[model samples]
Target: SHMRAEERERLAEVEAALEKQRQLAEAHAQAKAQAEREAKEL
Candidate 1:
């Protein structure tokens, strides 16, 4: 089964790493937008 056993562990780890990367990317984009906004105000 895809949801159980040892093979699923590898997939789970990949998914976890992917989720973290996605979050980091989103945060980076948000920070860049905020920086741009602040720069425009100066």
Candidate 2:
């Protein structure tokens, strides 16, 4: 695909945003599960 430089920059930014969000959400859920299980002992 022949995209312009601006689009390339935007694409990179969008990809970065989504990837960061994925990691952030996964870590948040993981932390929550850890604490929840520790407290509940389940």
Candidate 3:
């Protein structure tokens, strides 16, 4: 039982890491688009 719980905990940690990277990529893409828009306006 303890081992199974430990495995679940580890899986949750990996999921959190993946979510963080996903958000990071999304933010980066947003920033890139905003920059391009500003350049276009200029």
Candidate 4:
């Protein structure tokens, strides 16, 4: 089965949003880890 052109475009947009969310999550985790390390050092 084949999807229409508009369906493919919609799916691509959703996939890009998911990728952006994943990157933000990763950045937050890294910052948290750094803060925790600094706290322990003090």
Report the CA-based lDDT of candidate 3 relative to the real structure.
Answer: 0.95
Q: Higher-lDDT candidate among 1 and 2? A: 2
- Comparing candidate 1 with candidate 3, which one achieves the higher lDDT? 3
Q: Once model 2 is optimally superposed onto the true structure by TM-score, how far is the C-alpha of residue 3 displaced, in angstroms? A: 2.2
lDDT of 4 by residue, 1-42 (tens): 588999999999999999999999999999999999999978
Q: Taking the tens digit of each residue's C-alpha lDDT, what string does model 2 give over 1-42? A: 789999999999999999999999999999999999899965
Model 4 spans > 4 angstroms off: none
lDDT of 4 at 19: 99
Q: Kindly list the per-residue Cα lDDT of model 1 for residues 1-42, writing each as its tens digit.
A: 446667688989999999999999999999999999999988
Q: Cα lDDT of all candidates, in order?
A: 0.92, 0.96, 0.95, 0.96
Highest-TM-score candidate: 2
Task: Give the higher-TM-score candidate: 2 or 4.
Answer: 2
- Please count the clashing residue pairs in each candidate, in the order shown: 0, 0, 0, 0
| Residue runs of model 2 more than 4 Å from their true location after superposition | none
- Model 1 local distance difference test score: 0.92
Model 2 misses residue 11 by how many Å?
0.5
The collision pairs in model 3 are none
Candidate 3's TM-score reads 0.71
TM-score of each: 0.75, 0.76, 0.71, 0.72
